[PDB]
Design an enzyme around this catalytic site. Sequence first.
Site, short mmCIF file in Angstrom:
data_model
loop_
_atom_site.label_atom_id
_atom_site.label_comp_id
_atom_site.label_asym_id
_atom_site.label_seq_id
_atom_site.Cartn_x
_atom_site.Cartn_y
_atom_site.Cartn_z
N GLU A 54 1.16 -0.98 -0.43
CA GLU A 54 -0.04 0.01 -0.07
C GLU A 54 0.93 1.26 0.46
OE1 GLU A 54 -2.25 -0.47 3.86
OE2 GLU A 54 -2.03 1.38 3.33
N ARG A 65 -3.64 11.44 6.77
CA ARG A 65 -3.46 10.20 5.36
C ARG A 65 -3.76 10.52 4.98
NH1 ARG A 65 -0.66 4.22 6.00
NH2 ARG A 65 -0.90 4.93 3.71
N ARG A 69 -5.38 5.74 -1.48
CA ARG A 69 -4.19 4.98 -1.54
C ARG A 69 -4.19 4.00 -3.17
NH1 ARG A 69 -4.97 6.69 2.71
NH2 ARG A 69 -4.72 6.18 4.61
N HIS A 85 -10.69 4.50 1.53
CA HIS A 85 -10.44 4.05 2.84
C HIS A 85 -10.41 1.93 2.09
CE1 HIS A 85 -9.17 3.59 7.26
NE2 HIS A 85 -8.24 4.74 6.60
#
Lengths: 96, 96
Positions: A54, A65, A69, A85
Amino acid sequence: DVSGTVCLSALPPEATDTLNLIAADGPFPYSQDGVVFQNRESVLPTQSYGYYHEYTVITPGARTRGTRRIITGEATQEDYYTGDHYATFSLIDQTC
Amino acid sequence: DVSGTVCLSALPPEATDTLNLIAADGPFPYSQDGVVFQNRESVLPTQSYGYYHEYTVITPGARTRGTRRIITGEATQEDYYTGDHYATFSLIDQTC
């Protein structure tokens, strides 16, 4: 399951930045970048431990953050984007 | 389905503030804090009405209560985070 495929050009610009850092092997802005993604919920295809890693896609303005991703798989061109998420994923098409 | 588990340290700092208020049973900033969460979309496990309650996670900069919440269940440490106005949820792991 994977939601579909999305062109890189259709994703936030920060996704391009993350992909460029992955190609370079870093350095990465966040300490968590490059850790194994366990795929515990079985959203992505079943693979061996360590198949997935990741990386953060920066969210402009965020203090944390955030929720975006890229998950790499070991196969060529196998990269998944999530903006929520880890709830949903799309395969990234770097050709468009 | 729940999207996964998330470390408390990975959430916005205001999530910790909300969990501390829940532990103290307030006083809470908003009059809607502590109302029953009805789980109408059945994202979370099905339970009797009143099992779940919801609490605001303040979003600095927002003009409203925003989209971040903690939902509690009755089991010990059964605390869920949503950052997207109840669309998706993660179980909070307060140990990391």
